[PDB]
Amino acid sequence: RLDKSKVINSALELLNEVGIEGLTTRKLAQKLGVEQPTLYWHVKNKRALLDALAIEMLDRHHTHFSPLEGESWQDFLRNNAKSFRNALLSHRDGAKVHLGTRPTEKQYETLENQLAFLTQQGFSLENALYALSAVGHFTLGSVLEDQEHQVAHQGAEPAFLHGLESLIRGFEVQLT
Amino acid sequence: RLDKSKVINSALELLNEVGIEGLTTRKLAQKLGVEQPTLYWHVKNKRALLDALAIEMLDRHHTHFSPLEGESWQDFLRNNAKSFRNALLSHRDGAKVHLGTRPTEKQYETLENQLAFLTQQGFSLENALYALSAVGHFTLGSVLEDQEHQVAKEEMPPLLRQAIEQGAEPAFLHGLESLIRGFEVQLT
RNA sequence: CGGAGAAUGUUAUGGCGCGAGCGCAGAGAAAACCGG
């Protein structure tokens, strides 16, 4: 009948059409061909819908949350930022959708596993959390301004890549 | 007796009370004790009000937009970021208010003076725009998550629980240092 | 008090209730309608 699969697939399509500000559960119910009380069992309001959209965009496109076999910490942080940025760009206003959500327990566990990997490579526990925070804040900030100006030099990927590189070589220095 | 000075002063007080999501020109009109048609002459909608609020917090708190006498480019970028961050934190949801406003002509001129200062100090024109953009994106991202976090204070793994033992300023300062110490490398 | 988490509408120079004035409300509105 009507599973979480069609709910979120239709919700992500309507997010692209309308954006985060005009997206309503009523437009999703009409797009799905269901009454609003029926949809309330799968999504209870806009806040719950945005929470689900952000989680789904990460599971779909944030694939490089863990280091690969024999991958340097520099390459890991590099591809962790690119993966996170791809999720935010997977859909319209994806960074705005992500900013309004609260992290699940699985994301905290994933973050602890990242601190473990960084501390294993010579990072202090304090510096390992700062490196991950800085990369996240920079990536989120870059996409937020990029998607805000996407309503209208050009090309935000070079700015992101050169800034991510500035972070990585800065991390290398502060190790010594 | 309703001038632009009292409008934004009341508006920023109202921003702290209700936040960016609950801020409306009608609640501003009610706080000012005027009918909505009267307030329309000074601010035309929420978008115009947010544009004014973002500019006002910068003029008030973004004071270190220019290098001091004999101040290194490292110290300038450091204190330019700290000054910019102070503006975003000056009021509730200040980073969200800033995000979505379009730069005026004076900040383009102010920004040109910043590329000028950086290009003099050895930066390539290309690298000067990358350094300033990265510092801006990092500062904006840090305050956005920081201000989003202290709203969630209406309500975990131990190694993560060992790092939490407390605010966002230490993370901001160290991350800002990672950028600058990285900029030093990319010059050579 | 209930149909009802109704409709419509979004972020308000307007919409609405009472009657210049007082009052209501925002995507889990204010109105309007039906029922005891």
Short mmCIF file of all heavy atoms in Angstrom, two decimals, chain B residues 16-71:
data_model
loop_
_atom_site.label_atom_id
_atom_site.label_comp_id
_atom_site.label_asym_id
_atom_site.label_seq_id
_atom_site.Cartn_x
_atom_site.Cartn_y
_atom_site.Cartn_z
N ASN B 16 15.77 38.46 19.92
CA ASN B 16 16.22 37.68 21.06
C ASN B 16 15.06 36.98 21.76
O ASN B 16 15.22 35.86 22.25
CB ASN B 16 16.96 38.59 22.05
CG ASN B 16 18.38 38.90 21.60
OD1 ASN B 16 19.05 38.06 21.00
ND2 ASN B 16 18.85 40.10 21.91
N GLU B 17 13.89 37.62 21.80
CA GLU B 17 12.77 37.06 22.56
C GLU B 17 12.19 35.84 21.87
O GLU B 17 11.98 34.79 22.50
CB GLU B 17 11.69 38.13 22.75
CG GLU B 17 12.13 39.33 23.58
CD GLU B 17 11.08 40.42 23.63
OE1 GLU B 17 9.94 40.17 23.19
OE2 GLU B 17 11.39 41.53 24.11
N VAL B 18 11.92 35.94 20.57
CA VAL B 18 11.16 34.92 19.84
C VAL B 18 12.02 34.10 18.90
O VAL B 18 11.63 32.97 18.56
CB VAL B 18 9.97 35.54 19.07
CG1 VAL B 18 9.15 36.43 20.00
CG2 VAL B 18 10.47 36.35 17.88
N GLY B 19 13.18 34.61 18.47
CA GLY B 19 13.99 33.94 17.47
C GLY B 19 13.60 34.30 16.05
O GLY B 19 12.59 34.96 15.78
N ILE B 20 14.44 33.85 15.11
CA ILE B 20 14.24 34.19 13.71
C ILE B 20 12.97 33.55 13.16
O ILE B 20 12.30 34.12 12.29
CB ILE B 20 15.48 33.79 12.87
CG1 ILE B 20 15.37 34.36 11.46
CG2 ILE B 20 15.66 32.28 12.84
CD1 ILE B 20 16.54 34.01 10.56
N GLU B 21 12.60 32.36 13.66
CA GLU B 21 11.43 31.67 13.12
C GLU B 21 10.13 32.29 13.60
O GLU B 21 9.13 32.28 12.86
CB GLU B 21 11.48 30.19 13.51
CG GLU B 21 10.76 29.28 12.53
CD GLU B 21 11.39 29.29 11.15
OE1 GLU B 21 12.64 29.34 11.06
OE2 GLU B 21 10.64 29.25 10.15
N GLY B 22 10.11 32.85 14.80
CA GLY B 22 8.94 33.51 15.34
C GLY B 22 8.91 35.00 15.15
O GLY B 22 7.98 35.65 15.64
N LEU B 23 9.88 35.58 14.45
CA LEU B 23 9.94 37.02 14.26
C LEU B 23 9.07 37.42 13.07
O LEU B 23 9.23 36.89 11.96
CB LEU B 23 11.38 37.46 14.04
CG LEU B 23 11.62 38.86 13.47
CD1 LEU B 23 11.42 39.92 14.54
CD2 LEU B 23 13.01 38.96 12.86
N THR B 24 8.15 38.35 13.30
CA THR B 24 7.27 38.86 12.26
C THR B 24 7.19 40.37 12.38
O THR B 24 7.38 40.93 13.46
CB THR B 24 5.85 38.27 12.34
OG1 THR B 24 5.15 38.85 13.45
CG2 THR B 24 5.88 36.76 12.49
N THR B 25 6.91 41.03 11.25
CA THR B 25 6.73 42.47 11.27
C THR B 25 5.50 42.87 12.08
O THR B 25 5.44 43.98 12.61
CB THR B 25 6.61 43.02 9.84
OG1 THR B 25 5.44 42.48 9.21
CG2 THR B 25 7.84 42.63 9.03
N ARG B 26 4.51 41.97 12.19
CA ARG B 26 3.31 42.29 12.96
C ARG B 26 3.60 42.30 14.45
O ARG B 26 3.12 43.18 15.17
CB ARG B 26 2.20 41.30 12.63
CG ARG B 26 0.87 41.61 13.30
CD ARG B 26 0.06 40.35 13.54
NE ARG B 26 -0.24 39.66 12.29
CZ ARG B 26 -0.43 38.35 12.19
NH1 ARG B 26 -0.34 37.58 13.27
NH2 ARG B 26 -0.70 37.80 11.02
N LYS B 27 4.38 41.33 14.94
CA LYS B 27 4.79 41.36 16.34
C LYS B 27 5.72 42.53 16.62
O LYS B 27 5.74 43.05 17.74
CB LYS B 27 5.45 40.03 16.72
CG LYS B 27 4.46 38.92 17.02
CD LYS B 27 4.84 37.62 16.33
CE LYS B 27 5.04 36.49 17.32
NZ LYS B 27 5.24 35.19 16.63
N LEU B 28 6.49 42.97 15.62
CA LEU B 28 7.30 44.17 15.78
C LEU B 28 6.42 45.41 15.86
O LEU B 28 6.67 46.31 16.67
CB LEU B 28 8.30 44.29 14.64
CG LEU B 28 9.15 45.56 14.62
CD1 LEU B 28 9.99 45.66 15.88
CD2 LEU B 28 10.03 45.60 13.37
N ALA B 29 5.38 45.47 15.02
CA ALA B 29 4.43 46.58 15.10
C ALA B 29 3.73 46.62 16.45
O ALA B 29 3.54 47.69 17.03
CB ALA B 29 3.41 46.48 13.97
N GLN B 30 3.34 45.45 16.97
CA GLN B 30 2.68 45.40 18.27
C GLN B 30 3.64 45.78 19.39
O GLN B 30 3.26 46.50 20.32
CB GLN B 30 2.09 44.02 18.50
CG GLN B 30 1.94 43.63 19.97
CD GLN B 30 1.63 42.16 20.16
OE1 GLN B 30 1.52 41.41 19.19
NE2 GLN B 30 1.47 41.75 21.41
N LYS B 31 4.89 45.32 19.31
CA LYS B 31 5.88 45.71 20.31
C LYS B 31 6.15 47.21 20.28
O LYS B 31 6.40 47.82 21.32
CB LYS B 31 7.18 44.93 20.10
CG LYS B 31 8.17 45.04 21.25
CD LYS B 31 9.54 44.50 20.86
CE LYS B 31 10.22 43.83 22.04
NZ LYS B 31 10.84 44.82 22.96
N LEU B 32 6.10 47.82 19.09
CA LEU B 32 6.30 49.25 18.95
C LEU B 32 5.04 50.05 19.26
O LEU B 32 5.12 51.28 19.40
CB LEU B 32 6.77 49.59 17.54
CG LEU B 32 8.21 49.19 17.19
CD1 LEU B 32 8.39 49.10 15.68
CD2 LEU B 32 9.19 50.18 17.79
N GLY B 33 3.89 49.40 19.38
CA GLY B 33 2.65 50.11 19.63
C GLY B 33 2.11 50.88 18.45
O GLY B 33 1.52 51.95 18.63
N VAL B 34 2.30 50.36 17.24
CA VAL B 34 1.83 51.01 16.02
C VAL B 34 1.06 50.00 15.19
O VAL B 34 1.27 48.79 15.30
CB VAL B 34 3.00 51.62 15.20
CG1 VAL B 34 3.76 52.64 16.02
CG2 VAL B 34 3.92 50.52 14.70
N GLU B 35 0.16 50.51 14.36
CA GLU B 35 -0.54 49.66 13.41
C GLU B 35 0.41 49.19 12.31
O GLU B 35 1.44 49.82 12.03
CB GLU B 35 -1.74 50.40 12.80
CG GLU B 35 -2.74 50.89 13.83
CD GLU B 35 -3.31 49.77 14.68
OE1 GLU B 35 -3.85 48.80 14.10
OE2 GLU B 35 -3.21 49.85 15.92
N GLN B 36 0.05 48.07 11.69
CA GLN B 36 0.88 47.52 10.62
C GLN B 36 1.08 48.48 9.45
O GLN B 36 2.23 48.57 8.97
CB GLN B 36 0.28 46.19 10.13
CG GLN B 36 0.33 45.07 11.15
CD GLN B 36 0.16 43.70 10.53
OE1 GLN B 36 1.12 43.13 10.00
NE2 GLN B 36 -1.05 43.18 10.58
N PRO B 37 0.07 49.19 8.94
CA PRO B 37 0.34 50.15 7.86
C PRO B 37 1.39 51.20 8.21
O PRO B 37 2.12 51.65 7.32
CB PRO B 37 -1.03 50.79 7.61
CG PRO B 37 -2.00 49.75 8.02
CD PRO B 37 -1.38 49.08 9.21
N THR B 38 1.47 51.61 9.48
CA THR B 38 2.49 52.58 9.88
C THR B 38 3.89 51.99 9.75
O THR B 38 4.79 52.63 9.20
CB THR B 38 2.23 53.05 11.31
OG1 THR B 38 0.90 53.58 11.41
CG2 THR B 38 3.23 54.12 11.71
N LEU B 39 4.10 50.78 10.27
CA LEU B 39 5.42 50.16 10.22
C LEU B 39 5.84 49.85 8.79
O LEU B 39 7.04 49.77 8.50
CB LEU B 39 5.44 48.89 11.07
CG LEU B 39 6.81 48.26 11.31
CD1 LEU B 39 7.72 49.23 12.06
CD2 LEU B 39 6.68 46.95 12.07
N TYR B 40 4.88 49.67 7.88
CA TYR B 40 5.21 49.32 6.50
C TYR B 40 6.04 50.41 5.82
O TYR B 40 6.79 50.12 4.88
CB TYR B 40 3.93 49.07 5.71
CG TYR B 40 4.16 48.69 4.26
CD1 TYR B 40 4.50 47.39 3.91
CD2 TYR B 40 4.03 49.63 3.24
CE1 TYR B 40 4.71 47.03 2.59
CE2 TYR B 40 4.23 49.28 1.92
CZ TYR B 40 4.58 47.98 1.60
OH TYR B 40 4.78 47.63 0.29
N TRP B 41 5.94 51.65 6.29
CA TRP B 41 6.71 52.74 5.69
C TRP B 41 8.20 52.60 5.98
O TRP B 41 9.02 53.11 5.21
CB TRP B 41 6.19 54.08 6.19
CG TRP B 41 4.88 54.49 5.57
CD1 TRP B 41 3.64 54.01 5.89
CD2 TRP B 41 4.69 55.46 4.53
NE1 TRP B 41 2.69 54.62 5.11
CE2 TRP B 41 3.30 55.51 4.27
CE3 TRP B 41 5.55 56.28 3.80
CZ2 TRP B 41 2.76 56.36 3.30
CZ3 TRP B 41 5.01 57.12 2.85
CH2 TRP B 41 3.63 57.15 2.60
N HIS B 42 8.57 51.93 7.07
CA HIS B 42 9.97 51.78 7.46
C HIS B 42 10.56 50.44 7.04
O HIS B 42 11.71 50.39 6.59
CB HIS B 42 10.11 51.94 8.97
CG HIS B 42 9.59 53.24 9.50
ND1 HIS B 42 8.25 53.56 9.49
CD2 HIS B 42 10.22 54.30 10.06
CE1 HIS B 42 8.08 54.76 10.01
NE2 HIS B 42 9.26 55.23 10.37
N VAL B 43 9.80 49.35 7.16
CA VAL B 43 10.24 48.02 6.74
C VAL B 43 9.05 47.35 6.05
O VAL B 43 7.93 47.39 6.57
CB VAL B 43 10.76 47.18 7.92
CG1 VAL B 43 9.80 47.23 9.11
CG2 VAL B 43 11.02 45.75 7.49
N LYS B 44 9.30 46.76 4.87
CA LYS B 44 8.21 46.28 4.02
C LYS B 44 7.83 44.83 4.26
O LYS B 44 6.70 44.44 3.93
CB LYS B 44 8.56 46.43 2.53
CG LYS B 44 8.91 47.84 2.01
CD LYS B 44 10.21 48.42 2.55
CE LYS B 44 10.36 49.87 2.13
NZ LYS B 44 9.27 50.66 2.73
N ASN B 45 8.72 44.02 4.83
CA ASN B 45 8.40 42.62 5.13
C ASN B 45 9.52 42.05 5.99
O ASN B 45 10.48 42.74 6.33
CB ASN B 45 8.20 41.79 3.86
CG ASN B 45 9.17 42.16 2.75
OD1 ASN B 45 10.38 42.24 2.97
ND2 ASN B 45 8.64 42.40 1.55
N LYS B 46 9.37 40.77 6.34
CA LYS B 46 10.37 40.10 7.16
C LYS B 46 11.73 40.07 6.46
O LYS B 46 12.77 40.22 7.11
CB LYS B 46 9.90 38.68 7.48
CG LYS B 46 10.81 37.91 8.41
CD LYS B 46 10.23 36.53 8.70
CE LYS B 46 11.11 35.75 9.65
NZ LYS B 46 10.39 34.59 10.25
N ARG B 47 11.73 39.85 5.14
CA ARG B 47 12.99 39.80 4.40
C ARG B 47 13.75 41.12 4.51
O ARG B 47 14.97 41.13 4.69
CB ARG B 47 12.72 39.45 2.94
CG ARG B 47 13.97 39.39 2.08
CD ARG B 47 14.84 38.20 2.44
NE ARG B 47 15.93 38.57 3.34
CZ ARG B 47 16.56 37.71 4.14
NH1 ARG B 47 16.21 36.43 4.15
NH2 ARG B 47 17.54 38.13 4.92
N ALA B 48 13.04 42.25 4.39
CA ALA B 48 13.68 43.55 4.55
C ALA B 48 14.16 43.75 5.98
O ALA B 48 15.20 44.37 6.21
CB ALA B 48 12.73 44.66 4.13
N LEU B 49 13.40 43.25 6.96
CA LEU B 49 13.80 43.39 8.35
C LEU B 49 15.06 42.59 8.65
O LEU B 49 15.97 43.08 9.33
CB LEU B 49 12.67 42.96 9.28
CG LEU B 49 12.90 43.16 10.78
CD1 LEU B 49 13.17 44.62 11.09
CD2 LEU B 49 11.72 42.64 11.58
N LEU B 50 15.15 41.36 8.13
CA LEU B 50 16.34 40.55 8.34
C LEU B 50 17.56 41.16 7.66
O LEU B 50 18.66 41.14 8.21
CB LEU B 50 16.10 39.13 7.84
CG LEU B 50 15.05 38.32 8.59
CD1 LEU B 50 14.66 37.08 7.80
CD2 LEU B 50 15.54 37.94 9.98
N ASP B 51 17.38 41.70 6.45
CA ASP B 51 18.46 42.40 5.77
C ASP B 51 19.01 43.53 6.64
O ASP B 51 20.23 43.72 6.72
CB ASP B 51 17.98 42.94 4.43
CG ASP B 51 17.82 41.85 3.38
OD1 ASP B 51 18.08 40.68 3.70
OD2 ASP B 51 17.42 42.18 2.25
N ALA B 52 18.12 44.29 7.29
CA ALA B 52 18.57 45.39 8.14
C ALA B 52 19.23 44.87 9.42
O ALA B 52 20.22 45.44 9.88
CB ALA B 52 17.39 46.30 8.48
N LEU B 53 18.69 43.80 10.00
CA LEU B 53 19.27 43.25 11.22
C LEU B 53 20.68 42.74 10.98
O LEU B 53 21.57 42.94 11.82
CB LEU B 53 18.38 42.14 11.78
CG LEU B 53 16.98 42.53 12.25
CD1 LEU B 53 16.30 41.38 12.97
CD2 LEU B 53 17.04 43.77 13.13
N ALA B 54 20.91 42.09 9.84
CA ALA B 54 22.24 41.57 9.54
C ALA B 54 23.26 42.70 9.40
O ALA B 54 24.38 42.59 9.90
CB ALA B 54 22.20 40.72 8.27
N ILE B 55 22.88 43.78 8.72
CA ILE B 55 23.78 44.91 8.55
C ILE B 55 24.08 45.57 9.90
O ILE B 55 25.22 45.95 10.18
CB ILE B 55 23.20 45.91 7.54
CG1 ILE B 55 22.99 45.25 6.18
CG2 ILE B 55 24.10 47.13 7.41
CD1 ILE B 55 22.25 46.11 5.18
N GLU B 56 23.06 45.71 10.75
CA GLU B 56 23.23 46.42 12.01
C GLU B 56 24.18 45.68 12.95
O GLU B 56 25.01 46.31 13.61
CB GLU B 56 21.88 46.64 12.68
CG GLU B 56 21.96 47.38 14.01
CD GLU B 56 22.36 48.83 13.86
OE1 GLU B 56 22.25 49.37 12.73
OE2 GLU B 56 22.78 49.44 14.86
N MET B 57 24.08 44.35 13.02
CA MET B 57 24.98 43.60 13.89
C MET B 57 26.43 43.70 13.43
O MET B 57 27.34 43.65 14.26
CB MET B 57 24.55 42.14 13.97
CG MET B 57 23.08 41.93 14.31
SD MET B 57 22.76 40.30 15.01
CE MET B 57 22.02 39.47 13.61
N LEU B 58 26.65 43.84 12.12
CA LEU B 58 28.02 44.00 11.63
C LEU B 58 28.56 45.38 11.98
O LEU B 58 29.68 45.50 12.50
CB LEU B 58 28.05 43.78 10.11
CG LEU B 58 27.70 42.37 9.63
CD1 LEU B 58 27.50 42.36 8.12
CD2 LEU B 58 28.78 41.38 10.04
N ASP B 59 27.79 46.43 11.71
CA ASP B 59 28.22 47.78 12.06
C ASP B 59 28.47 47.92 13.56
O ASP B 59 29.32 48.71 13.98
CB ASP B 59 27.19 48.80 11.59
CG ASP B 59 26.99 48.78 10.09
OD1 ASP B 59 27.85 48.21 9.38
OD2 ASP B 59 25.97 49.33 9.61
N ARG B 60 27.73 47.16 14.37
CA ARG B 60 27.89 47.25 15.82
C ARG B 60 29.10 46.45 16.31
O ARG B 60 29.86 46.94 17.14
CB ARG B 60 26.62 46.75 16.51
CG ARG B 60 25.46 47.73 16.52
CD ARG B 60 24.27 47.13 17.25
NE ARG B 60 23.18 48.09 17.42
CZ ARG B 60 22.22 47.97 18.33
NH1 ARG B 60 22.21 46.93 19.15
NH2 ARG B 60 21.27 48.89 18.42
N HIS B 61 29.28 45.23 15.80
CA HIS B 61 30.24 44.30 16.38
C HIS B 61 31.33 43.83 15.43
O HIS B 61 32.37 43.36 15.91
CB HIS B 61 29.52 43.07 16.94
CG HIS B 61 28.60 43.38 18.08
ND1 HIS B 61 27.32 43.86 17.90
CD2 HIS B 61 28.78 43.29 19.42
CE1 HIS B 61 26.75 44.05 19.08
NE2 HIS B 61 27.61 43.71 20.02
N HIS B 62 31.14 43.92 14.11
CA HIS B 62 32.19 43.56 13.16
C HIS B 62 33.10 44.77 12.97
O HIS B 62 33.05 45.49 11.97
CB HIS B 62 31.59 43.08 11.84
CG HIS B 62 32.58 42.38 10.95
ND1 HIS B 62 33.70 41.75 11.44
CD2 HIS B 62 32.60 42.22 9.61
CE1 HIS B 62 34.38 41.22 10.43
NE2 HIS B 62 33.73 41.50 9.31
N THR B 63 33.96 44.99 13.97
CA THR B 63 34.82 46.16 14.01
C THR B 63 36.19 45.93 13.39
O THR B 63 36.83 46.89 12.95
CB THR B 63 35.00 46.64 15.45
OG1 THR B 63 35.93 45.78 16.13
CG2 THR B 63 33.67 46.62 16.19
N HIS B 64 36.67 44.68 13.35
CA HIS B 64 38.02 44.39 12.89
C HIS B 64 38.01 43.84 11.46
O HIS B 64 38.49 42.74 11.18
CB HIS B 64 38.70 43.41 13.85
CG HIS B 64 40.19 43.38 13.72
ND1 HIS B 64 40.84 42.81 12.65
CD2 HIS B 64 41.17 43.86 14.54
CE1 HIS B 64 42.14 42.93 12.80
NE2 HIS B 64 42.37 43.56 13.94
N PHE B 65 37.45 44.64 10.56
CA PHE B 65 37.43 44.30 9.14
C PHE B 65 38.70 44.72 8.42
O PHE B 65 38.92 44.30 7.28
CB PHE B 65 36.21 44.93 8.46
CG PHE B 65 36.04 46.39 8.76
CD1 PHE B 65 36.78 47.35 8.07
CD2 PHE B 65 35.14 46.82 9.72
CE1 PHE B 65 36.62 48.70 8.35
CE2 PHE B 65 34.98 48.16 10.00
CZ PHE B 65 35.72 49.10 9.31
N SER B 66 39.54 45.54 9.05
CA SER B 66 40.76 46.05 8.46
C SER B 66 41.96 45.71 9.33
O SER B 66 41.84 45.60 10.56
CB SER B 66 40.69 47.58 8.28
OG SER B 66 40.21 48.21 9.45
N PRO B 67 43.13 45.52 8.73
CA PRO B 67 44.33 45.24 9.54
C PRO B 67 44.77 46.46 10.32
O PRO B 67 44.57 47.61 9.91
CB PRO B 67 45.38 44.85 8.49
CG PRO B 67 44.93 45.53 7.24
CD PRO B 67 43.43 45.52 7.29
N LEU B 68 45.37 46.21 11.48
CA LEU B 68 45.90 47.27 12.31
C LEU B 68 47.28 47.69 11.80
O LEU B 68 47.82 47.12 10.85
CB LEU B 68 45.97 46.82 13.77
CG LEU B 68 44.64 46.61 14.50
CD1 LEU B 68 44.87 46.49 16.00
CD2 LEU B 68 43.67 47.74 14.19
N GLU B 69 47.85 48.71 12.44
CA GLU B 69 49.18 49.17 12.06
C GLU B 69 50.20 48.07 12.34
O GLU B 69 50.38 47.64 13.48
CB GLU B 69 49.54 50.44 12.83
CG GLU B 69 50.76 51.17 12.30
CD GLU B 69 51.22 52.28 13.22
OE1 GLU B 69 51.09 52.14 14.45
OE2 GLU B 69 51.71 53.31 12.70
N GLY B 70 50.88 47.62 11.29
CA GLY B 70 51.88 46.58 11.43
C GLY B 70 51.35 45.26 11.93
O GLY B 70 52.05 44.55 12.66
N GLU B 71 50.12 44.91 11.55
CA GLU B 71 49.52 43.64 11.95
C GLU B 71 49.72 42.62 10.84
O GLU B 71 49.43 42.90 9.67
CB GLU B 71 48.03 43.81 12.25
CG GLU B 71 47.27 42.50 12.33
CD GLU B 71 45.83 42.68 12.77
OE1 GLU B 71 45.01 43.14 11.95
OE2 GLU B 71 45.52 42.35 13.93
#
